[PDB]
Design a binder for these strands. Structure first.
Lengths: 21, 106
RNA sequence: AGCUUUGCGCAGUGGCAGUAUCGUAGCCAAUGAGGUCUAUCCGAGGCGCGAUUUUGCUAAUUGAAAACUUCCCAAUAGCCGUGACGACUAGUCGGCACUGGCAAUUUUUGACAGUCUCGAGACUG
């Protein structure tokens, strides 16, 4: 099987500079 | 379905105009277009939760005869801070896409 | 009374070609433009300048985006044994629950498939 590659956001986050999980 | 498309429909023709400046054109489109023919409704696409104008918008015109001249005279005309590109509206709602699907198989 | 000729206007149905179409508050022109077969003859536009690949609609492509008021996690949605609860006399029965199993003659992991004859039988593997 294969799962959609869970990606993240770079710009316009409105959150902390560090990463969410 | 968005209950916001039932304010301009009076058998009128909706000119469908893009290339509108984000920072401006809140009502400058209405100001510019009011000269011909008279008072009408002109609204700009502005998404909520951000206050950011998505640019493009509509303008309702009473008569297609007036719409033809309006398009030919304002196609690319400098409005606000950008020239506007004008085309025809679609209003591809459910009552029309169902008929389109029915015609496709025919 | 029909038939018919010419010019113009408006539409419909076809064919052909895009090295050509158009404009001319510029000039010249039947009081003659233009004559390289062709001349006591023929007879209409020419020159210069300017524009150039309309519009609506549809299809394809590029890319992250081609312009108009979504993804993920947790849980819910037959029988044989076992554990309790219960009921009836160590045994039996009913419902509930889940901590093993359910292709080897009586069933649920296939004696089925092909053929022929007038609802009924025969042949083969």
């Amino acid at each position: 099987v294969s799962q959609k590659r869970k990606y993240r956001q770079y710009m316009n986050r409105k959150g902390g500079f560090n990463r969410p999980l | 379905e968005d209950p916001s498309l039932l304010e301009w429909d009076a058998d009128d023709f909706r000119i469908f105009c893009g290339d509108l400046g984000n920072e401006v054109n809140d009502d400058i489109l209405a100001r510019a277009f009011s000269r011909f023919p008279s008072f009408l409704k002109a609204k700009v696409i502005r998404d909520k939760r951000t206050g950011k104008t998505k640019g493009y918008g509509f303008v309702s015109f009473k008569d297609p005869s007036d719409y033809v001249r309006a398009m030919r005279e304002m196609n690319g005309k400098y409005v606000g801070s950008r020239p506007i590109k004008l085309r025809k509206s679609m209003w591809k709602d459910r009552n029309l896409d169902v008929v389109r699907k029915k015609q496709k198989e025919k």
